[PDB]
Amino acid sequence: DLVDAEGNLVEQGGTYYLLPHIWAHGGGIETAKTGNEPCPLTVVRSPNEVSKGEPIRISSQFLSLFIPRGSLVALGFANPPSCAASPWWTVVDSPQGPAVKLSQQKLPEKDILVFKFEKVSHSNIHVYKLLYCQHDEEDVKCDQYIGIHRDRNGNRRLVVTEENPLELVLLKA
């Protein structure tokens, strides 16, 4: 089950701050403008440890008051940057591997309903790793994790990683 930082069920379509489990790992999630992006379309972990980052909308593919047990979810900024077609995060291929981004294009649900929270056993509160579920063509398979990769400019980019999956606690905004 998806539970928030205070022990309560996460609400379908509700807004939360995605913060690290370990205080020293940084602040919340936000955006950054990288490469040739017209506006901040790169999803990153804030450069300020005190910041809760951006309020994030969490939604599953089901009509429910709360995020159903073990369901896939879409994640989006409640207040996205101007040049994004929608608030939803999506995973885009690149020379270095899949990266989490916002898009200037309208996205089909199969391109945004690609995340799944996985509870970490060793914890007293509810902490979750973020799984990325790629296309098993007819359906999907959540066999990868989202992590951080600092680029040349220091931006802590959210990307599919082979090690050190990021962990998060969901604080109601």
Binding site for Ni ion (CB under 5 A): 21, 167
Distance CA 55, CA 173 (A): 6
- Residue 76, Cα to own-chain centre: how many angstroms? 8
Minimum distance, C-beta of residue 145 to Ni ion, in the bound complex (Å): 13
| 140 touches 72 (CB < 8 A) | yes
How far apart (Å, rounded) are the C-alpha atoms in residues 28 and 172? 12
Query: What is the smallest separation between the CB atom of 119 and Ni ion, expressed in angstroms?
Result: 11
Q: How far apart are CA 110 and CA 165, in angstroms?
A: 23
Pick 30 or 167: Cβ nearer Ni ion: 167
Q: Min. distance of Cβ 63 from Ni ion in angstroms?
A: 33
H-helix or E-strand spanning residue 29: strand 29-32
Alpha-carbon distance 168 to 173, whole Å? 15
Of 4 and 167, nearer to Ni ion (C-beta) is: 167
| Least distance in angstroms from the C-beta of 45 to Ni ion | 14
| Closest-approach residue to Ni ion (CB) | 21
The residue to which tokens 């969901």 are assigned: 170
Least Å distance between CB 135 and Ni ion?
Answer: 29
Residue 24 or 65 with smaller CB distance to Ni ion: 24
Which residue number, 54 or 167, has a Cβ lying nearer to Ni ion?
A: 167
